[model samples]
Target chain A: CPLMVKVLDAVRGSPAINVAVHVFRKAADDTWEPFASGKTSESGELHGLTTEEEFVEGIYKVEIDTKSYWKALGISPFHEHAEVVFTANDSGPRRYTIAALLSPYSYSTTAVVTNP
Target chain B: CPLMVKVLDAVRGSPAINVAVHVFRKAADDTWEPFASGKTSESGELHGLTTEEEFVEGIYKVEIDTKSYWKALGISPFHEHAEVVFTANDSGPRRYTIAALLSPYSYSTTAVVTNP
Candidate 1:
């Protein structure tokens, strides 16, 4: 199963278009290494960042480059980046999705695991 | 002027006491270097993370170890860390404050600059 991520504008409740997204997997040394990277599409969605890789039960990080997005909107962002970190479960559902709601000042994320 | 940070629980709307806080200043190489680190007090506030350092105009980052805090309460946290990054203005009032509202699933932050 693959992990899907969706980014959205918090205030307008619309998709956050063309935002850069990065994924990192935590290494044994406690350092994070980039696993994958891509940009959001018209629907503000990025999928398969984790599906291609072999399932590893560990910590993973997802970061949205909100600074550049806000800069494009001509706003001074309160935060440079919005990041969400969570642990992957090997058993049960293999598919997971993270939905991130972001604004210049705040962000909220929710995750759901689906079993097939 | 110094940068102050306050942490609070979003649901209970109370102070997030004894939480670990880390501050980093963006360096020339685009890497973040630890500027200061401390734990929130009973009031859930940390002050002087930037007050002692010579005022420099650059980006800074603040990270709260919300994972451990939530784990202490026997809950699974959606995000391991809550982070905020912003720029510092040196010309005006150097005293800036960031207040963060956090929960197991969501977080919000706001900043203000004060002159004294």
Candidate 2:
């Protein structure tokens, strides 16, 4: 339940800039359900998905839009985009902390669960 | 494409060990396709998926089965699992490199495309 989101600004002279945040959950038929979507705020924080009901047990996905997000800042990400997929098993009270570190051309994320 | 995979062994006294690899592709309706599945080899490499045809242009998912994989090693990953999702545009000649570093309690991955 420690689900959190963060982003780093693009470096000077980099071709990539922003990041688009998309979240999804797995369905009964083993498909993914679009749960949330948003762009990183100017402060590089993605708080649009600040709720627990939006997520359920099973597989979850996080898509980072590297192209368009960077283009807006006059940068072209070398890679089209990046993604982080994780699974949640319990629905009990938990803190799902998810965080991302990004540069003009790369990014990374952590899906950690901390006790509240 | 230069699709690559790597893994790091768990340290002693750690409660985590292996990783489960699952690949997927996005469908016309934006759903996901179960493209490939495997576990890390003894050398910490996941070469079970070594074909370009198995991958297509669109969203691709990589799910890490942390729980069962770790349990087998007599470890209990604090977290259940982790995931990485990426997007591919052109199906032309391209090398996609995906590498992951994992420990008993943490992991990371990189999606890189290098020219052939």
Candidate 3:
């Protein structure tokens, strides 16, 4: 199971905030291709992105446009961008889950490899 | 460009804290192996883990023991485990970068594909 990038935002004293994520995979020529991209709904979770056969064992990069996301709220940020890079080992049994939690100034992300 | 996992911690009003990180990859037998593991120094950064040829294109998962990490500081964590799942595309030119930031209760991760 590869480490998938998770994007999130925090409301400081509140527990409600908007969330979104953009996933990118490295291409042959050393370029990034959009593997799967989606945004978390009002529930603050992005439950999208299904796996395909094309994405096999390799390295990939994902960028969550946090700058634009926070900008929408008219707030200044210490980090303009949020990104994560990880590797995938198997394409079989393509079941995966990634999670993230964000605060007013920072955030965290993690993926569940096997949940039984 | 695969999404690499970065781990960190935040100190409320202070810009100083200790940090650590662990890297894991799914093996061919449908299991995870400690691909590369290291802890962030006193600088709050884990600047280790060099890539090898074995981690080619595939799906992988990484878990940062945030519970035990924070527990050492005598703090109860909202999350027991922090994990990330991501894919890798190309392994020919194996040069990758991963980053993360963690606060008292949350954290975030991102990887840089090409920093040029």
Candidate 4:
């Protein structure tokens, strides 16, 4: 199973390049363990942050640092950051994709099984 | 002063036609009072829902029934409704605009003063 993350600039209607992204997994001890951290590529994709580890049914979180990204772009963002929290279930090892559409003022995210 | 509402389909990158929209103002009694209700036109716009009312400074909410729209298109929406809450300040009676970006699974909203 693979977990993919894609980011887009909702205002510009293009891929959000070089955006910082962080992924975390919630442990049974109620602690968020950081699993992957990286920046998006020119294609607005963060590669290799998938479920290559032992697939577990639990809560996972992805945080996009849009504030910093917008600041680097010389734009002031109304919303600082966008957080996406979802559950990972073992639905027969499928590829899951989490896509975030963002602008300076607002953002939204969705997770779906890409390849069954 | 005017308040404008726009809806778009983030997935298809097009205006979402005929989306049902509702605007509500929070009263001093802490109750949500429905002020304006309408649907988006072919341009995905709902006109005349802005500050035509007394333009009192308070919290206002906008609800978009995306599930029904997507259902009419024969698509399944992961999220049913998108809610937008903002503070309507006097700001010298400016024209405000709220734009909603929506997909079957995710949505985002932004509010801005359209005119000085």
Q: Mind giving the per-residue lDDT tens digits that candidate 1 earns over B1-116?
A: 38788999876678998899998888889899988889998899997665545647788888889888888878777677878778877666557788878877667677766787
Instruction: State candidate 3's TM-score.
Output: 0.46
Deviating ranges (above 4 Å) for candidate 1: A90-94, A114-116, B114-116
| Tens-digit per-residue lDDT, B1-116, candidate 2 | 34655655446533222457788777888777788777776666676474667655666766777667767877766545556666654647577656655554456556667756
In angstroms, the error of model 2 at B102 is 2.1
Mark the regions of model 3 whose C-alpha exceeds 4 Å error after superposition.
Answer: A1-8, A12-18, A52-55, A91-94, B1-116
> lDDT by residue for model 4 over B1-116, one digit each (tens)?
47788999987889999999988888889888998889999999998765555666767777788878898999876554666665666465567777888877677777777545
The TM-score obtained by model 2 is 0.66
What TM-score would candidate 1 get against the native? 0.85
lDDT of 2 at B16: 28
Q: Second chain only: TM-score per model?
A: 0.90, 0.76, 0.69, 0.88
Error of 3 at B116 (Å): 31
C-alpha lDDT (0 to 100) for residue B25 of candidate 4: 86
The C-alpha stretches of model 4 lying farther than 4 A from their native spots are A1-104, A112-116, B51-53
User: Over the stretch A1-116, how does candidate 1's per-residue lDDT look in tens digits?
Assistant: 37888889976778999899898989989999888888888899986665534657778888889889988988877777877787776464367777778877667677776775
Worst 10 residues of 1 chain B by lDDT: B47-56
Local accuracy of candidate 4 as per-residue lDDT tens digits, A1-116 = 37788999877888999999998888889888987878999999987875557546677777788878888889976544666665666656567777888777677777677546
Top-scoring candidate (TM-score): 1
How do all models score by TM-score? Answer: 0.85, 0.66, 0.46, 0.55
For model 1 chain A, give the 10-residue run with minimal summed lDDT.
A47-56
Query: Where in model 2 is the C-alpha error above 4 Å?
Result: A1-3, A9-18, A51-60, A74-82, A85-94, A103-106, A112-116, B9-18, B27-31, B51-59, B74-82, B87-91, B103-106
